[PDB]
């Protein structure tokens, strides 16, 4: 895959040019706020278990037709698979937030997912609803605005990282 | 691209785990070392023409026999191509310092170097003598700081060992 540093190099290769001063300064900002990026990511991972159950139970309550007979989350086998793969999507989002590039999310999880969901009969309307809940939960955890769970962290701003998380979850919803 | 970040993400991905403290500890190491590496990459970027052009001269001084007919470097077009390859290698070393690992070197110059040079009859010791001379000029602190020189010399010793 490609991280934030490696994305700069790949762009400079297409022109066969050395990494210029202008691009290097962009990396220096990435490194300077590198403590915030790990400080963001730890918040997402530490609450990964409750984020997914927020999404899956929330998606079902607004669309009760999923658990009705003939639905795609009817039995325990389908419900377990819904939780398992929904957590996989969240796992690859933290990789993208940690690495600073969305290439890892696109290549290893998002590649060919849409064509598979069609074969299994998984509804796309319900899947994107579950993902959009995960983005709202992660952003609230990233900015430290969760209602019932507080983590002690030095005062500062994280609009840059919250905007990063929101865009990564939007890529998943746009692909399928 | 092997680096600090991809090695731990690939290790965590194989086991199916979320990024734990062990993975966040590795990325923290990148923050400490990124200060020194990005000074060496800046120095090389602004002086690649002088380093490359003197490096090629040292290779041909050690091995005058490359000038003879029937050998690599027997004409003026061939000799220019020799300097062009050293520029490519010095360009990937600049990529290695920025990326922070041996990623760009492995997948763009080292992977098939054994078969290509053998097929085209390019001796490997001609490329070795180019990097040894460059590594010998490198002095502290006129060129770069104490830590930047260590980071730069580390990439050059990696390249030589693959041609050895």
């Amino acid at each position, epitope marked *: 895959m490609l991280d934030a540093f490696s994305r700069v190099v790949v762009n400079s290769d297409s022109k066969a040019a050395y990494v210029s001063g202008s691009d290097l300064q962009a990396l220096k900002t990435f490194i300077a706020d590198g403590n915030k990026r790990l400080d963001a990511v730890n918040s997402i991972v530490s609450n990964a278990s409750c984020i997914v159950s927020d999404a899956v139970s929330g998606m079902i309550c607004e669309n009760p037709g999923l658990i009705a007979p003939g639905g795609n989350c009817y039995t325990n086998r389908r419900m377990a698979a819904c939780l398992r793969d929904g957590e996989i999507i969240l796992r690859y989002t933290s990789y993208a937030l940690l690495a600073g590039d969305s290439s890892v999310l696109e290549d290893r999880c998002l590649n060919g997912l849409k064509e598979t969901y069609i074969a299994l009969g998984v509804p796309t309307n319900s899947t994107v609803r579950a993902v959009s809940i995960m983005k709202s939960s992660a952003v609230a955890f990233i900015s430290n605005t969760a209602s019932q769970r507080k983590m002690a962290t030095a005062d500062g701003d994280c609009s840059a990282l919250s905007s990063e998380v929101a865009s990564y979850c939007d890529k998943v919803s746009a692909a399928i | 691209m092997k680096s600090v970040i991809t090695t731990t993400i690939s290790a965590a991905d194989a086991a199916g785990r979320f990024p734990s403290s062990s993975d966040l500890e590795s990325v923290q190491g990148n923050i400490q070392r990124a200060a020194s590496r990005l000074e060496a990459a800046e120095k090389l970027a602004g002086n690649h023409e002088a380093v490359v*052009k003197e490096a090629g001269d040292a290779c041909f001084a050690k091995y005058p026999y490359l000038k003879n007919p029937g050998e690599a470097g027997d004409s003026q077009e061939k000799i*220019n191509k020799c300097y062009r390859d050293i520029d490519h290698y010095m360009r990937l070393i600049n990529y290695s310092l920025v990326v922070g690992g041996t990623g760009p070197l492995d997948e763009w110059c080292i992977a098939g170097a054994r078969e290509v040079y053998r097929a085209l009859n390019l001796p490997g010791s001609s490329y070795i003598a180019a990097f040894v001379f460059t590594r010998d000029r490198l002095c502290v602190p006129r060129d770069m700081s104490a830590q930047a020189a260590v980071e730069f010399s580390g990439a050059l010793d990696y390249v030589i060992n693959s041609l050895c």
Partner: T-cell receptor, first 112, second 107 residues
Framework: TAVFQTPNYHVTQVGNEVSFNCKQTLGHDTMYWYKQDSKKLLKIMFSYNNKQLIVNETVPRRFSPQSSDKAHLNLRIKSVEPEDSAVYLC???????????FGPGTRLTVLE | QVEQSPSALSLHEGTSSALRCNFTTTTRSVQWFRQNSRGSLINLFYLASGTKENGRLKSAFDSKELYSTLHIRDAQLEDSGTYFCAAEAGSFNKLTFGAGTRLAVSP
């Protein structure tokens, strides 16, 4: 053998746009446009390797080089001033090793 | 970055002298140029830390001493022209020229 460029001569007035084209038939890859002033002092104005500019000697933005092929190098000058009256020289050489082969050159005259 | 003294030198046939072109920084190679009456520059010498002879001239270059010399002997009528010394000193990227020397021969 040598480098030939066209047109041979070109004289224009203030406000016009001029363009000299140089072509070279050797196996060379780097071309230069030397701007020798009225004092016969040669100062490098543009240098182009393949498709990438490699030399910019604090050239004002009005001078714009347009290169199509490695054997072609044009120059379009806008907002031409009378003070820019000089003799322009086309050069060609290998980028790293080799001597520079010059052409006859072009003279530009601006009329008050 | 090139100082040339004297600016012009008109020598009678048989009299011995030399032409010098001085540099401030290390130079890989020097190109000597000849400008005809039409103003076209014809390449004369191209050497890199060595000695080359062509007709009645000779050139040299010492990298440690940062200078170059040119010697003329038995000037002929056809050798009229302007002498130019160009050095690749600096960042080994651009060519820098000297002031120039004009020589004319009478029959």
């Amino acid at each position: 053998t040598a480098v030939f460029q066209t047109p041979n001569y070109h004289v224009t007035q203030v406000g016009n746009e001029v363009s000299f084209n140089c072509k070279q038939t050797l196996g060379h890859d780097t071309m230069y446009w030397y701007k020798q002033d009225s004092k016969k002092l040669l100062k490098i104005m543009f240098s182009y390797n393949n498709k990438q500019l490699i030399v910019n000697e604090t050239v004002p933005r009005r001078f714009s080089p347009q290169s199509s092929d490695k054997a072609h190098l044009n120059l379009r000058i806008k907002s031409v001033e009378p003070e820019d009256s000089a003799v322009y020289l086309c050069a060609s050489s290998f980028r790293w090793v080799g001597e520079q082969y010059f052409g006859p050159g072009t003279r530009l005259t601006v009329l008050e | 970055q090139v100082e040339q003294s004297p600016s012009a030198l008109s020598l009678h046939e048989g009299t011995s002298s030399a032409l010098r072109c001085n540099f401030t920084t290390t130079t890989r190679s020097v190109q000597w140029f000849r400008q005809n009456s039409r103003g076209s520059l014809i390449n004369l010498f191209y050497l890199a830390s060595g000695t080359k002879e062509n007709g009645r001239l000779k050139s040299a270059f010492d990298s440690k001493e940062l200078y170059s010399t040119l010697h003329i002997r038995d000037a002929q009528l056809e050798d009229s022209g302007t002498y130019f010394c160009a050095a690749e000193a600096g960042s080994f990227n651009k060519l820098t020229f000297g002031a120039g020397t004009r020589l004319a021969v009478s029959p």
